[PDB]
Write a protein that binds this DNA or RNA. Structure first.
Ligand SMILES: [Mg+2]
Ligand SMILES: [Mg+2]
Ligand SMILES: [Mg+2]
Lengths: 152, 65, 143, 102, 142, 72, 212, 184, 71
RNA sequence: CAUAGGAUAGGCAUUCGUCGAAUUCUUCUCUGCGGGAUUCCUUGUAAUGCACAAGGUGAAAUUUUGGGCAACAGCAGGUCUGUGAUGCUCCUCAAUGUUCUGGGCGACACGCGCACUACAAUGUCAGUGAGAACAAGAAAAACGAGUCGAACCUACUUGAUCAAAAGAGUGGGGAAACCCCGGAAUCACAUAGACUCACUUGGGACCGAGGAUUGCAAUUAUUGGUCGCGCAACGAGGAAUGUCUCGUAGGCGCAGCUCAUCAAACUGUGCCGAUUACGUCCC
């Protein structure tokens, strides 16, 4: 009996569930709905110049922009460049020491642009990106689903 | 192999100081012939007194100093 | 009609974890907002749990503990949190409870690991010139 | 109030306290309702050169440091009353700076 | 992939005059032909409708004839212009993408172009020397 | 040498569903040299036997997964 | 924006470092001994410490007048902003910077090296100094250079407290045959007000007090 | 409610004893919720004998530059090791380890003290060299092998626990003792 | 925590001469006297002087100490 | 109660650009002077003494840790390539002065120091999570509007009905105030992800073709990025050899410094975090 209320606590939100379980179900929600606007570049391109080959998951633009949607819930006011530090890599240079590179803000611009067209992100009052009230409804309702194990 | 107890550490021996000269009491089963027998033997490794160790051939004694 | 609240701290290297222990209707211990069933490595969730486990689950019965940690990286934020919790129980029993109920559960912490309560004073030693680190020198070559 | 902030910066640790405590002991006599002198973090300045002017020897170094001491005091007096608090011949090497907050 | 082996599974398939180890995955055996590499073999498996999970020897003859025209003529399949090997091609001017035997052929035609005129980057290949800004005092050792 | 197959033959997949649930301590490297298949198949062949409940998953991580027989 | 407080402590140090070099070259035979400058609104003070205040001042202040406007034209001060003063050292025997410039002139006037250096140490140790040390290095005797040191009294050298108690200055003497360098170290005695010497005792002197 | 820790919330420390009565003080059987503890066991001379024996396996895995500092890995890598040891032996795996440490190192050895005289081995070094020679050898087994490290480590611990000669340590434990018997 | 320098030992005998009556077998009270009877700047030496003073108070309970000049 | 779904706390349920109001605080933060550690206490060594070992006490236990500073003599060590430090001596108007222009310092049969990258599955890849400390940052008696601008670093938007790298707007910051809740990398992950022991999806040397930035100038590629090449050795290294005793070695990155553009360097800083010894005079 793994799913039940613990004591008096009656609901869930983000940071009350697993981070991957939220992102995987949010990625699952986006393609099952179909209203997402996946760009044509996501077939050809690579997530950064620090990655050495293509993301090799056909749902990777769904898993990204669900991770990004979680990364607006935490840190409102985050821009494209603050997200590039979140998804950056340690790049393999050949015979030289490895240095950290921040990810291409291009795909992070498409990721926020898709989530605005859902209505889940608002462009912020003065800073970068803000979660709309529909997004708070979406992020928490989906996070209650993953504790009662309704992953779909 | 008989289990003997270190009752005395007689100082660091050898050239490089890695070997330790001890005085080991043999700790037999008290009805035995070789009970309460004490031997002066060389121990390799970190050894404090009251440290039990196993002995293959107990009839040898090391040359002291 | 009252507020029973206690703030404690823990430090390991640079991780300073401030645990705000207060009385609530339900036990709810969460480190930076993560509810301690969800601290991700099962190894480091077990070091934060033995702040609760060596003393008993009964003593954290209706206590809401909020551990806010900053500094010092992944493993040092577990020893900062598990010390902020274990100090947090005891400073909740320095007030609000008598000395007989404490100082048994203080010594249950001290018998298990000395670093549930005091601190680990070890910091990084500075790099010096002529050395790659605190101690390792440049390579001498002779020929 | 006008909320004038005086910035006491100095290179000497014994001269920055002998100004700030003297400047504060002036601003108690007019009952100004100050917000107390805070100690902003001291900034040390490292120049780590070689010791040798030539090239050889063991490659020895020497780090030089220079600490800047930094204090601010907020006081609600008008702008010619804070010039009464400010005007006194200080020690050499201590800079004071009058700033009006909002 | 929890599926049985087919009867026609070649351990070595031959595509673009190149032997290709059919025991490997389908892009990573398709990079064995020159000119392809990993970053382009995932685009040949994507434009041909080939599942990347399958092994290269299960590719049938109708699937291998579709691969060879994605590699010979990739601009008809909307693989973009920046993705190709030979993009502005001096003495031709047209964007190409060079196949197995053609990479080494026009490499020799480029080293001969820079040696007909006495350009310095062609003089370095005549003497066998390093061509870019390497020092080549302590590290050639050939 | 160590030439392993990269897909199942019909003969060796029948070895997968019969002999492997009788083993104790099934791992994808135990199956890789007993059945002469690559570990990428051996790990895939053992995930199939868990959902049919023929073997048990006794220890799981992202890399290392240890399986055992079910005793009933 | 204005420069940062980190950028202004730099330019205020390079101000004092350049002002110190100019006056060390000018006032060498005036017995120069240091500068303190005090900056405020309406005026920038510069106080010059010397041993010969009739010479660093001119006949009517002529010498300091020229020496004022050399600092004005260089550092781009305006009229009224820059005022200079001369104070004299009260002792002259506790200032290592003055004594080394005199020992520079005792050699350049072709006196004997050892007669000159003991004339310093006799004058320094009669002036209340706890100790003194004069080192003359160079071609003293002939073609090949020597080093001689001449010593009397205490001298603390290994502590970092010797910056508080020991006054030092080194100059060059340009002989006809080469270059001689002279050094003068003077251990400051007393002066709890900080006239010449620290207030606190030496770091190892305990001095148990007597009971009433 | 002090629920007396198992080890990974699975394996109890209740029944541990040592066959070697020479090595009881130096093999520590105190309980832990994980191998990792971050304590200073190296200040005093014999204090690392008070370190729990399951931690000392995790410290022996952190070798060769590809492993220096990866203790959370070695705790994970030992988590799957101890579960495999349960499947090979059908016993408490921690007793299998204490039986492996007790048999893993030679009781006698030979050094030059003055000729090449045979010298007894202290109980502290016999706990060190047993842990050392089992992490070694399991490391060299899995170096270009199909087998994972939690299998090769689990095989060295089992075969040394039985005293079989298939273990790497027991080949060297018997080579050193027969050389020491001939260098008497 | 090793041998006391003669700076510590000569000063500690002078505290026992001038202030024998104000001192007993405790460190933490003898330290507070020596801060008022010794004008030195270091707290490290004043800890060492109060350690060797306490030592030669236990020696004066037994018998005579050489060089003590108690008079 | 996941497609197959384990292990693991529990008077008033919980969560916060929500760019809320209030009204009480110093727990953490900053920091000028100051406490605290002394062999202090204890019971064997030693035998008066100076002290020593083990344990206590404690935040810290023996130079507390880590550095700085270091006498006296001397070396025919290095520096006349640091100085408007210098003596002697050479050159001194087609000058060995000083400036331009173009080369060179970097050239490669080779021999050596020092790093860097690896030889793989305790891994490579592609994801996803948690999450550091030291630090830097713009300008002149110039050119512009005695006051202010622009040079410097940066978030944020844009570019974007479509690759990076860019290119542009718009804010902010004189630096505890903006970057910044400094989203470093090791690591982590029950990721039900690909590879499966191969010179291989290890390794990334070599060089081919677009393109864009720094500069007055890129050829003897300045640097980044894209797709090729990868069939270049390399499978753990002969004789020899270097550094190290605890937050250490090793691994990991990040700043600063050189810097218009360029770190396999050095000076610093944090992160993960051991093996062994606590000995000896064998070399
Ligand atoms: Mg060197
Ligand atoms: Mg005048
Ligand atoms: Mg060889």
């Amino acid at each position: 009996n793994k799913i039940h209320r613990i004591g008096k606590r009656k609901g869930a939100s983000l940071k009350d569930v697993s981070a991957w379980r939220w992102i995987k179900t949010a990625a699952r929600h986006f393609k099952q709905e179909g209203k997402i606007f996946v760009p044509n570049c996501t077939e050809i391109m690579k997530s950064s110049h620090g990655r050495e080959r293509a993301p090799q998951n056909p749902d990777w633009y769904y898993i990204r922009c669900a991770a990004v949607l979680r990364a607006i819930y935490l840190r409102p006011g985050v821009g494209y460049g603050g997200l590039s530090k979140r998804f950056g890599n340690k790049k393999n240079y050949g015979s030289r020491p490895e240095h950290t590179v921040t990810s291409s803000t291009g795909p992070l611009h498409w990721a926020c642009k898709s989530l605005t067209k859902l209505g889940l992100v608002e462009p912020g009052a003065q800073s970068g990106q803000r979660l709309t009230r529909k997004g708070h409804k979406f992020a928490d309702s989906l996070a209650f689903q993953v504790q009662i194990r309704k992953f779909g | 192999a008989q289990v003997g107890l270190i009752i005395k550490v007689l100082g660091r021996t050898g050239s490089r100081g890695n070997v330790t000269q001890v005085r080991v009491r043999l700790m037999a089963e008290a009805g035995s012939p070789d009970y309460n027998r004490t031997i002066v033997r060389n121990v390799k490794g970190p050894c404090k007194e009251n440290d039990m160790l196993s002995l293959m051939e107990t009839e040898r004694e090391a040359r002291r100093l | 009609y009252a507020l029973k609240q206690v703030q404690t701290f823990g430090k390991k290297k640079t991780a300073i974890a401030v645990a705000t222990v207060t009385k609530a209707a339900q036990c709810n211990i969460k480190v930076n907002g993560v509810p301690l069933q969800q601290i991700l490595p099962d190894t480091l969730r077990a070091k934060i749990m033995e702040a609760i486990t060596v003393v008993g689950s009964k003593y954290y019965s209706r206590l809401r503990i909020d551990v806010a940690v900053h500094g010092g990286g992944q493993v040092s934020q577990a020893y900062a949190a598990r010390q902020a919790i274990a100090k947090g129980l005891i400073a909740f029993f320095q007030k609000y409870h008598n000395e007989v109920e404490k100082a048994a559960l203080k010594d249950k912490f001290l018998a298990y690991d000395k670093f549930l309560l005091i601190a680990d004073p070890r910091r990084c030693e500075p790099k010096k010139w002529g050395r790659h680190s605190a101690r390792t020198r440049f390579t001498k070559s002779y020929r | 109030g006008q909320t004038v902030r005086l910035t006491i910066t100095s290179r000497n640790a014994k001269a920055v306290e002998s100004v700030t405590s003297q400047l504060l002991m002036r601003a108690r006599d007019e009952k100004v309702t100050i917000h107390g002198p805070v100690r902003l973090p001291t900034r040390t300045l490292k120049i780590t050169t070689r010791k040798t002017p030539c090239g050889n020897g063991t490659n020895t170094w020497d780090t030089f440091e220079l600490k800047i001491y930094k204090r601010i005091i907020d006081l609600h007096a008008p702008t010619e009353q804070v010039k009464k608090i400010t005007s006194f011949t200080m020690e050499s090497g201590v800079d004071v700076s009058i700033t009006i907050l909002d | 992939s929890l599926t049985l082996i087919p009867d026609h599974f070649q351990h070595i398939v031959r595509l673009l005059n190149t032997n290709v180890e059919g025991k490997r995955k389908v892009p990573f055996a398709l990079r064995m032909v020159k000119g392809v590499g990993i970053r382009f073999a995932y685009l040949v498996c994507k434009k041909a409708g080939i599942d990347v999970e399958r092994r290269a020897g299960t590719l049938t003859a109708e699937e291998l004839e579709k691969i060879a025209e994605i590699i010979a003529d990739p601009a008809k399949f909307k693989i973009p212009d920046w993705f190709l090997n030979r993009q502005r091609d001096p003495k031709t001017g047209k964007t190409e993408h060079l196949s197995s035997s053609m990479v080494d052929t026009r490499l020799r035609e480029d080293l001969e172009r820079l040696k007909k005129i006495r350009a310095h980057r062609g003089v370095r290949h005549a003497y066998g020397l390093r061509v870019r800004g390497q020092h080549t005092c302590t590290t050639g050792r050939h | 040498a160590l030439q392993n197959a990269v897909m199942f033959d019909k003969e060796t997949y029948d070895k997968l569903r019969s002999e492997v649930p009788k083993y104790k301590l099934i791992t994808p490297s135990i199956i890789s040299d007993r059945l002469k298949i690559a570990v990428s198949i051996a790990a895939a062949g053992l995930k199939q036997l868990c959902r049919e409940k023929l073997i048990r998953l006794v220890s799981c991580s992202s890399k290392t997964r240890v399986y055992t027989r079910i005793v009933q | 924006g204005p420069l940062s407080k980190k950028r202004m402590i730099i330019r205020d140090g390079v101000f004092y470092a350049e002002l110190f070099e100019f006056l060390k070259r000018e006032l060498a035979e005036e017995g120069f001994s240091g500068v303190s400058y005090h900056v405020t609104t309406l005026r920038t003070e510069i106080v010059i410490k010397a041993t010969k205040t009739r010479e660093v001042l001119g006949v009517n202040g002529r010498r300091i007048r020229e020496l004022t406007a050399c600092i004005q034209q260089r550092f781009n001060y305006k009229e009224g902003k820059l005022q200079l003063y001369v104070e004299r050292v009260e002792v002259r025997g506790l200032s290592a910077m003055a004594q080394v410039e005199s020992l520079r002139f005792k050699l350049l006037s072709n006196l004997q090296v050892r007669r000159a250096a003991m004339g310093i140490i006799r004058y320094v140790m009669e002036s209340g100094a706890k100790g003194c040390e004069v080192t003359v290095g160079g071609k003293i005797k002939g073609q090949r250079a020597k080093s001689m040191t001449f010593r009397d009294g205490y001298m603390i050298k290994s502590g970092t407290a010797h910056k508080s108690f020991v006054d030092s200055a080194c100059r060059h003497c340009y002989m006809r045959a080469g270059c001689i360098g002279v050094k003068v170290k003077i251990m400051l005695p007393g002066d709890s007000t900080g006239r010449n010497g620290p207030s606190e005792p030496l770091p190892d002197v305990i001095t148990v007090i007597e009971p009433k | 409610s002090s629920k007396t820790p198992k080890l990974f919330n699975k394996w109890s420390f209740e029944g541990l004893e040592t066959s070697e009565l020479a090595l009881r003080d130096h093999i520590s059987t105190t309980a832990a919720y994980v191998p990792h503890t971050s304590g200073r066991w190296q200040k005093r001379r014999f204090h690392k004998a008070r370190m729990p024996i399951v931690e000392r396996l995790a410290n022996g895995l952190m070798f060769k530059g590809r492993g220096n500092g990866r203790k959370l890995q070695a705790a994970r890598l030992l988590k799957h090791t101890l579960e495999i040891i349960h499947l090979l032996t059908d016993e408490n795996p921690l007793q299998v380890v204490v039986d492996a440490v007790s048999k893993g190192a030679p009781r006698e050895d030979s050094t030059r003290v003055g000729r090449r005289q045979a010298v007894d081995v202290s109980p502290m070094r016999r706990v060190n060299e047993a842990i050392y020679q089992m992490c070694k050898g399991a490391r060299e087994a899995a170096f270009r092998n199909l087998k994972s490290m939690p299998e090769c480590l689990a095989d060295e611990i089992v075969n040394a626990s039985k005293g079989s000669s298939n273990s790497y340590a027991i080949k060297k434990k018997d080579e050193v003792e027969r050389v020491a018997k001939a260098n008497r | 925590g090793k041998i006391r320098t003669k700076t510590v030992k000569r000063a500690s005998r002078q505290v026992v001469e001038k202030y024998y009556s104000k001192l007993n077998f405790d460190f933490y009270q003898n330290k507070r006297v020596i801060m008022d009877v010794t004008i030195a700047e270091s707290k490290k030496l004043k800890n060492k002087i109060a350690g060797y003073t306490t030592h030669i108070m236990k020696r004066l309970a037994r018998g005579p100490v050489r060089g003590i000049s108690l008079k």
